[PDB]
Symmetry: D2
Subunit: 372 residues, 4 copies
């Protein structure tokens, strides 16, 4: 007997007339007081582990008292999830245009001086309520532009309209071959210690088309502006992108670990009644500017020597490149290392690369979040 | 006995060790006085007609006296050109990342006040020479960043390094199912009447990652800045993107028409000794902001009623949508029209679409370039 | 007020849980006497014109008296129809395995001597009824094998189970860039003159995995066997594959022409009450063994000189190959012709090919079907 | 100072004019007495581990005395190896037609009664020499058919022409997510104990388009026929397909293990002078008919519970299927097991499947090869 109310939302339509739909599960909060939450997975279609996280999270929630509304949208991009090419989900971008599904969210470009002038007389709570209504409506308005909008923009807008309703937004992703990491805005670095995530990227106030930024930027802007008029309060919305290890993988046991960390955060925020403690583990971070993409310096076949999630001392091998077309030479086999210490986070999912193919992303200038 | 000197440039490398190379043909100019030209085709791999244009152009050039250097780079993106998916060239974007090959060019972000202060003492010709050396070197420098650059950025940079050497840059493209059209910066609208192209889009001074913008923007910036210090001269470089009808098509007769229009422009610019007159035809334009993408308002099977390159009076059908899944209803067949007059330029190459698929691009607020 | 009863059939299931369904329209026959018909389109997902044919056919049928059941299955392969790669439907084969959807039908391998021995005592009509029940059941049985069957086999089997119920089966396809042609078994060449199709391929009694063969072979086998026991009757089932010009195209006017030819055949067979005459046009055929694939003798860019559907005298150019990488040589441009007269039927949809890419299929040893 | 002589063979040509080439390394044998060997890898382009095996094998061979010629063809399908789709090598089939590269080899259809009658007077050694010349020439003849042959047939034929020259043919492949296994014809089961491969599939005398069958079938046919004329000798050629664990992976240490097992076999056959012993390990086999494909009984997200290469007792879980679209039901999570004991060999590389997607291949009726 689940507590969840199940519905569905139409996000697009296929040529055969079949609706593209996303299933929505809602755990109603018992206190109108409590912060609400919107959790989605699998916008990048290969990144399926978020669905297992939602499954474990909802299973746990059957036994916790939910104070604030929790809305979960697994399988949030059916077009991408269902897109196969060989034995692999071509789920990252529109197969027609190449546009990354996670770069399709809407930037409101709010005239903040003006909007604030028209609503400054409201209390902090009323001001936040008006501002949220505006973010929802202007988002919904994109759906009825007379020359239309792209398939990817329609998907993104429908998801964003729901995300805007929530106080807390969690966008669940995976990397390729990847360890667990988190994208966390600067203003909310405090929150990083509640998730069960060893590595956090601290991101600035900047819109680059992603769900987390679409969700927090307008609120960050409003707050910095209000502070410049001597009206201090903390950013009313929190948004995070979780990167739950590797794509093309479902692991229920690992998903339960991730779900418990999420519950630790929801507990701390008063979304649930129970105290759920964060896991004990070493947690580190770096600023986004220090997170670097290493591109193949030449083409070849690749052995990935450096383990994801483990420190790599400068000079230790990151990859070996095999060039069997050059046997007889020193060029046939080459160890490649980096000139600084790093923590490699993820690497490319195939063992054959071109010159310029992304091999790894690595964090540099890493530090403990919670030094102890 | 061709006058062309043939060479080749390496633009990347495949996993098997095979070089990605672009063939380069150079017709040496006999006057160090004359403007030089760089012409490339087929960066978008499906857009093969530019190769036929280069072939007809070079055939013609065997009989004209070349005053200024002409460099031609057909087959400029071998990775994209050779990328098949079904009976179709998946040539528009990196198949790994989805990044559009024509959005990969380098924006120099020149500190223009500073650069100009260091070089103002030079004559106009010397200043232009110094500025060109800087554009070439900083472009070449991108090739040796220590974490590397993407496959697409390496391609784009190698092409751009050559384009920067020229006074006149022509990037030859095609649309999908498309009529002939041209992208022309505002400052050079005069040039549009020399090409054999009925429709021209007038573009502003704005960098969006394309070859034409990468080529002209720095020069446009320098000129507007110099004019603000009371030093007036016209923009020293010209760049144009030609859209030579439809992709996945080679038509030598049509390519000869296009080549003759190109020669008309090179003649007018003194690149060749002969007077070659522009073709007689009606020519029109619109500002870029008036060129609009019409997205499918619903999914279905599409009949493209409006001919590309012909005026479409408001209310006349653009497409019919067939929905054979809804037979028995009025929804089974639907004429779709637009609320304003337009000239449809191109449409989508497939007859099955989703909600949001791009159906057409159409020009609005069209006017004669050369009213007579 | 359509006469059609609309239903739907589930042919598979997507990872997100969405059913793959095919819409079914049935015009009930008023005479239990009359032959029944099964018509499907778009098993190859790019081959969308068959849907327009079904639309025109059903529109016409609203005004004809239907004597025998007519079942229509447009949009018969939703997975394939909805599979995009660039601006093109990758609809021909399973994107995971490469298996051609039209090579997935089930060969019953009937022990014909035995089956006939057990049922020889039945009248011709009863024997045909028993045989049809067996073909339907053994087909349906494939759906519940304990290790399962492939995605493509499940699709094919569900379609075939319906096709087996009918006396007349029409599988509607298109070629790539193609003229109208028909695949007709040898025993039913008489039927070819009723369709509005200039070129017919006469196929033997041979199973190669296609819907037409899956449908007619068992009946052809039964008949030849019965004839060897001195029991003469004509093959009780008719099956045809129609190739309705080019893929990625919807043309309602052209579809109406095709629908009228289909009605001419259904009329002649007594499926409808009215006399509908075949169109007046020259009709030709060749045996399948004389229909030939011409492969690119070298790679390059291709201009398709020979028009589909028109005779090509030996020595007249089929294609020109442009090799802009070889400018300066005779190899840069090469006319390719064939050593015998032919009728080119279809050619490759892209203008860039490899060595060995299929360029054309051409009929040789062509003759009038209906010499006059 | 490598002993290998390096050359290259052209196997096709790309639209830009670039040759498709395969690098060939030859270790000359010092005894005209000794059996020769042809070893190729990576015909399926994702299956890159064979290149690492060739690298380790050649490194070892620098220190062994080579008695018989050894020819190695790594990177044997550059078109397939270089074909990317997302972060994955779409290397299994022609991206244009869907035809599996490993189903493209040539079946000679030798009229064996006739050929043998014309050559019976020859000694066994002379007969084998004549027969090999015929297999090479008729293969080469396929390259000059006047309507050409497919891209895939041209590749396959060029490889096969070399394979036919050798006494021993090793085609090196990988599975998807897979343990090490071997395809071994029935007549040569003895050879299986020399490789370092725990599981062997015993295949019959049957041509299905693969390199191993193209190589051994004609010789198997000749031998069975000669035996029917009272002329007994053992099949003069040996061919094996090695499946070296998982695709999209290079592991040099694991490749060295595989190379040592190959050397064990070459030693036993007198291709090298040294005695190299086989590895000590348990080895098992099953007949091909007992090796089974398990297809997804419904669509969903998949957790692969059964480890490849380990026995799975009937009733133990093979996969769990997660259906997050059905949360609240028993259908949300389902353990799937098999009704008989098996050894799962490989599974599907993605975690999202359709109804009918291949989940695993499993061996049944397994037995020790070398019971002890
Ligand atoms: Zn993601
Ligand atoms: Zn383009
Ligand atoms: Zn077809
Ligand atoms: Zn393989």
């Amino acid at each position: 007997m689940t507590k969840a109310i199940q519905s569905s939302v139409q996000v697009g339509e296929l040529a055969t007339g079949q609706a593209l739909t996303v299933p929505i599960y809602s755990f109603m909060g018992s206190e109108n007081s409590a912060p609400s939450v919107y959790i989605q997975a699998n916008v990048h279609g290969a990144e399926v582990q978020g669905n297992a996280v939602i499954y474990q999270l909802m299973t746990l929630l059957e036994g916790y008292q939910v104070l604030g509304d929790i809305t979960l949208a697994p399988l949030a991009n059916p077009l991408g999830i269902n897109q196969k090419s060989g034995e692999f989900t071509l789920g990252r971008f529109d197969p027609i245009t190449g546009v990354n599904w996670n770069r399709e969210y809407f930037d409101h470009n709010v005239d903040i001086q003006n909007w604030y002038a028209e609503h400054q007389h409201l209390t902090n709570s009323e001001l936040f309520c008006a501002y949220r209504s505006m973010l929802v409506e202007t988002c919904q308005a994109r759906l009825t532009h007379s020359f239309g909008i792209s398939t990817g923009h329609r998907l993104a807008v429908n998801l964003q309209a729901m995300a805007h309703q929530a106080d807390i937004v969690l966008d669940l992703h995976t990397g390729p071959k990847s360890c667990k990491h988190l994208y966390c805005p600067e203003y909310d670095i405090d929150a990083a210690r509640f998730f069960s995530i060893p590595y956090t990227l601290i991101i600035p106030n900047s819109f680059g088309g992603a769900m987390d930024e679409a969700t927090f930027c307008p609120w960050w802007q409003l707050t910095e502006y209000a502070t410049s008029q001597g009206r201090e309060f903390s950013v009313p919305v929190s948004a995070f992108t979780l990167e739950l290890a590797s794509q093309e993988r479902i692991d229920l046991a690992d998903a339960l670990e991730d779900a418990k960390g999420i519950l630790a955060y929801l507990s701390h925020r008063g979304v649930i009644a129970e105290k759920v403690n964060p896991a004990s583990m070493e947690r580190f971070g770096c600023y986004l500017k220090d997170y670097k993409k290493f591109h193949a310096p030449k083409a070849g076949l690749i052995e990935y020597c450096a383990s994801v999630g483990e420190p790599l001392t400068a000079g230790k091998p990151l990859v070996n490149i095999l060039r069997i077309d050059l046997y007889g030479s020193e060029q046939a086999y080459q160890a490649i290392s980096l000139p600084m210490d790093c923590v490699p986070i993820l690497h490319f999912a195939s063992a054959s690369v071109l010159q310029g193919t992304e091999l790894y992303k690595v964090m540099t200038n890493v530090f403990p979040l919670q030094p102890s």
